Symmetry: D2
Subunit: 470 residues, 4 copies
């Protein structure tokens, strides 16, 4: 059972809007909105969205597998060996948020301070003592972006696995000689860094010049989660505030995806007339170029929605019904909707490009969608005894002042996959977990969970106290 | 009672090293080491220090007042009006960590997300609604370093007050006209930005080209806390590991200050022969140029300790007894002492230049000295009823779903000073508080508090859990 | 008669290698090599080439017209108005080397010091006094590359004309309102800057993603000058030194073009066996990325000449017969051929990317091919009386110490085209002329003119003397 | 006889303003203005000046010797060996415009293309073949400013000699070991680069924090050329246009120097009342910060001329009689004087900071003062037979197509000094010579030579023709 199976199962259910059913429903972890900092929903005057993996949740593992296949085919097309075609995407290997070390060709899972939690070279998981030869302090400087790439998005899941496939392949292929920083093939040397750049370039190519979008829109039922409760929630948001879309995707792709997401024989509720997707938004903005969007952005353009092309010129006019914007900046939203940052709840899946930057640069309120939580929540509750034992071993070890702690850690971790939970390895939290807590005011497996809370709900989190204040 | 009075009172006490007395002593908040992340002292192989406001704690308010006076005299010397000479330093006004907005000339106290907690123009404290005219989202982007300067160090305390004095003076002086971004005087316009740059330059000048150091060393009993337990703690650290100094100050000043700090008729304990301060250190490094020190640093030089001048050339040799280094980088320490980052406990007062950068860039373990805590702890415990009432009002307000919450907030805040606690305004934590929790593994009013813990103590902090994990 | 007609006429002639015929032939300006700084051909050990507009001289105006048409079609494809399709390339308008001012939308012809010689807005030529409203000092700062784009290459000829077509079109189209920095169309504003960026992007697109290369190689006799004396000259160079190619183009395109350039039923001379084009080169390098090539360049790769794709890895081996390189740097050439810079005569058409940078950054000897000189030489000799009169009027005016000087200037200039000679307006030299003299050691309408000089010819230029030295 | 002896000898002569005497006087090379590009003096509406080495010509070798001594004393003060005190400035060694190679510790004389003309390591002049070991192409990339420093100003003359003294000293001192890039002294390594940085820093220190200015103004008759014809020429300029000063020096130093330069018992002519120096200027600007001045500059300030300190605030008012400005930009001059660039003749000694930048960035007309020409002109005319022979040998060698050419070159060069003429080595022009021709419209040994030309003189230079145009 993948996380998108869970999401689709919940998506197939109709909305029972009886108040008692809602309060009962939101009590379950799977339909709950989790709270890092308190948020009074009554103060939210605008609800903003991105599209990919928020409104349009791509089904797993089918969509990752499609991206993987097209990326592999692109690398073979530009000269990588034919054996790449025998790879097959494996969803049990990658966890989101790993760091690829382009110097030594390792995938690393790290905590918020750069400490190594897991290190894998190809499919070989390197134990603590052996990692010290390359990482003397079992530590990396995350900000060295020339060396380290953080695979933070769900679009990065296929290349996370592909990097490991490639390192495994070249390590074990007799044509090549393994070296510390790459592979030697006579008079040719392929560094892990150039290999990584080829993979990155190929992933980009597949999304923007290849056939990924075409293959997606020709079979949207296979590739995109669909929920009849989406127009109900958006119609309810529009009753109490304004609603906007700000996506990096272009208008033609947005229109195809959004049309599918709203393709029901009804509108907000069963029995109601169908309405076009654009009617649910007070402001539609494509080609957003986030995260630059939250700084100076780009010039504001207007989409000719008949042709899908940009009109000639910078758009200088006002908000008009039916207009579609392109580029601009977050100040465009605030100006055209008459909003301040804390009036806005921005709902997205990119922990950096959506959530971190809108929080840090503009003081927007933030809702992080984490699709994998729809399944991680099931593992967490089902194996709570593993974690509880780990807590007790940690307390026992501290007051006593080992191999049992590592074994339980491994067993707990493997329930999530070969690279463990998105949020921790054993008792140690990941960088990703830390960023969620620090920058996502609210988070959930799906933003649909807002449907189960009344219009003026007060999301509450306990106040933080310093050690000397307790 | 200032925080340095508290520190000096504790410094005057002799060390009772009976184990039961120590454990009793460390139980009191004033002599406790507070723990943000767990740290096993047995794993620490090197203890590192800065000098200023860590080993050499400058007495308050005398030292700030000296800096203030010399800075004022410098501004008058370069052409500011004579009325500046009538200013007098007032320790009740500044709290450390405020942000000066060079655009509108305000001092701001902010939380970790840039939200305004306090706004003062000169000595006028601007209430919430009036702040929205200049801060529509009651929010600043901290990283806009061209506009905002964060007064993060104890050396910034005099200029924090001076900026407010100057804004007050020009606002109320009839020769000038107040404008949004500065002051008009006929054909001259002084922006808050250029005023701020003059103040910054004058503070720098006083420390490096003026008479501040000379005036300090000619009366060290007036200006520097002195503790006979300092050589005892350092001798104990040297029994179980290595000890190093890395200061931004030059050798001549370091030698004068450190000689005074060790000027007792005894060594580590009463009755023992006096030892020169250098003998307590395995590695002495001056002109450190932190925070650049934790990146590429500067070329490693050797101090001629006879003359106080640098020897000619880059030093290429090994660690030698009696050598004093200059410049270099944090890698110098690790190489010469055979240490890895997590082997090092680095003890400092600069939340950014010492603690943040050594943690983020090198994975060092960190101990933050917060001198003002020596007194903030007394206010916190004495007025705990104010805070407890505030907590209850917050809980009452949330479940009820105001003016009483603001009044209690003001009354609690004013016990610390006109700019409130270093760590909070009412129930809202400051940016400084957040950075302490995030980057200081341990913290205390003085590093001397390590004296009261056994050699292999395990400092413990509770594990963090995400909302969905609770 | 275009300059490529002249070049093709000379190209059709067979080589008479009798010494007396050669010396007679090189006496004519059209077959002469012109000399800015003395160069002893005996000291040249390597001859290097670019391909486009040096070996492969594209026929005029057919090739510019093709580029113009495809660029227009691309702009219409992305949303520019249909009326663009009625434009038709006009070779009499553009002169190479003009500056487009993106602020005011003017094409400018300037001297070496940025002084305005000609200013045209659309097709309106602005007289001196009217230019002062926008150019108060009749001067531009060339280095302000955010504002000014210098149309320095022959590939820039179509967009030079297109920019003027577009400014003319929008100025006179009733849908738009003309403003100082662009065109208003209700709520849309198109600045000259964004218009220029669209044109630049479309030209790039046509060359690298569009059909320009495909259309070129499907009719090479229409689009490319062909000269049976090319393999003769290259074979003669290989007798006395090494020969290399360094082109920005990719291998597949290079192979198609070079195969055509050598497609004769003979080799170096009539009667000799045909040889493949690669055999004429000791070193072949594609994807050169000049001018970055003359700095750090890019990593050295090897082309798989069977597939046209790059082999995997950085190439670390030696120079090998038959290998084709990709990327690298100018140091690659020097290392693999055992050359120093002054051993190299580098032959190219890009006054900046080829000639300036190889001279300034590496001290290479330089030969600049200027295709338009093949026709400018005919205008210069035929209308020498116009220029001679201008010289006399200048001398008369100086010793006398006007309208006649401007009229003669205009009449002389118009013989070259609407934008005058590449090298001057009247008696004032262009920036381009100055750069040729400063950075091209030798120059000619075609590098084929080297065929008419003996192996150890000494090209001589008179020494320069300062005013006080004369 | 130094060049300042020549200048002072001419300065002592009274002005005979009879028209026939003037025309006779300007015929002599020593009193002539030399012309690179034609300039109609009638079109000049503003005459601008710098102060140092233009209005205030420092006497040679006394002033260089003072700078040398203070720089040496500063290096010894910071820890260089005592033997430095035995150095003594030698004016016969340095020629202006040499390049110090911080990698290999050589002084280089180069032509405009970076070709090596002379190479000296310490006082050892390295012959051609031996230079190829470090300079394989006998070529340097001038723009590599991290490696090469061009000693372009007269203030650089002492450090030019000092760098050679130091390289000589350490090479031959037995305490040190000579290495390719510096000197080893056991565990200390002094690279030529760090040595050079010490020298540069010490020269800066002497000018701005040391006693150079104090020592200069306490004996101005020893250190500064004085000419009673200076106020006559400036009064004549003010009759036909405006006159401004723009100096990098501060007001207190400018006032002392300018007061001395005008300290005669008369004003413009003998018999006339003395006038204060400020009265000769329509605009006085100090702290100019050229060359940044010709870009965005700094904020415009006003000097309080009573105190010598800056008034508080940016100056926003108009040009007022008696006001003295500080900072600003070249646009300040143009705005306040109502000038365009080609209305301005800017007179200076810094070939880069004055002349190149005002020409390239603003299109100002330029007059370069070259003090050494006052003596180089005498060597040039007296040894014209050497140069004439060299020309003939060059022509003979070319048509013949050696050791005699090198011997004559050496003999000619040595008449100027150990580093030859500022303008050439033998028949090869220096970079400096090339920059003079390219950027100085007019040049002379002194700007006083303008006194000998009528108000509306037309300076004329022959037009430049390309090779194919001749």
């Amino acid at each position: 059972t993948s996380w998108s199976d869970r999401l689709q199962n919940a998506a197939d259910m109709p909305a029972n809007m009886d108040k008692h059913a809602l309060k009962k429903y939101r009590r379950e972890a799977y339909h709950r909105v989790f709270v890092n900092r308190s948020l009074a929903m009554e103060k939210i005057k605008c609800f903003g969205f991105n599209m990919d993996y928020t409104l349009a949740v791509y089904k797993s593992p089918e969509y990752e597998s499609l991206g993987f296949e097209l990326t592999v085919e692109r690398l073979v097309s530009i000269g990588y060996p034919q054996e790449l075609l025998s790879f097959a995407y494996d969803s049990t290997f990658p966890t989101r948020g790993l760091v690829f070390d382009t110097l030594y060709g390792n995938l690393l899972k790290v905590d918020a301070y750069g400490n190594l939690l897991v290190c894998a070279h190809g499919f070989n998981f390197i134990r603590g003592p052996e990692t010290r030869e390359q990482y003397p302090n079992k530590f990396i400087q995350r900000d060295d972006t020339e060396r380290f790439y953080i695979l933070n998005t769900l679009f990065n899941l296929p290349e996370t696995y592909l990097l490991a496939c490639l390192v495994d392949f070249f390590t074990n292929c007799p044509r090549y000689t393994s070296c510390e920083t790459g592979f030697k093939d006579g008079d040719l040397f392929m560094s892990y860094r150039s290999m990584f750049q080829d993979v990155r370039d190929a992933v980009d190519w597949v999304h923007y010049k290849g056939s990924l979008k075409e293959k997606t829109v020709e079979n949207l039922e296979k590739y995109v989660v669909k929920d009849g409760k989406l127009p109900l929630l958006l119609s309810r948001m529009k009753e109490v505030g304004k609603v906007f879309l700000a996506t990096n995707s272009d208008y033609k792709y947005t229109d195809k995806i959004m049309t599918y997401l709203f393709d029901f024989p009804h509108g907000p509720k069963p029995g109601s007339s169908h309405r076009p997707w654009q009617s649910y938004f007070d402001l539609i903005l494509v080609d957003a170029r986030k995260p630059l969007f939250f700084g100076e952005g780009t010039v504001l353009r207007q989409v000719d929605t008949k042709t899908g092309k940009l009109k000639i010129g910078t758009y200088t006019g006002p908000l008009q019904h039916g207009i579609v914007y392109s580029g601009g900046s977050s100040d465009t939203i605030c100006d055209l909707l008459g909003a301040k940052g804390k009036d806005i709840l921005y709902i997205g899946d990119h922990i950096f490009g959506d959530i971190l930057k809108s929080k840090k640069r503009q003081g927007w309120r933030t809702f992080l969608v984490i699709p994998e939580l729809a399944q991680e929540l099931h593992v967490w509750t089902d194996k709570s005894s593993l974690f509880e034992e780990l807590q007790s071993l940690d307390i026992f070890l501290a007051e006593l002042y080992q191999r049992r702690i590592k074994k339980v850690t491994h067993d707990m971790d493997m329930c999530y996959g070969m690279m463990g939970s998105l949020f921790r390895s054993g008792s140690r939290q990941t960088l990703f977990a830390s960023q969620v807590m620090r920058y996502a005011d609210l988070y959930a497996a799906s933003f649909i969970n807002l449907l189960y809370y009344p219009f003026s709900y007060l999301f509450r989190a306990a106040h933080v106290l310093m050690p000397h204040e307790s």
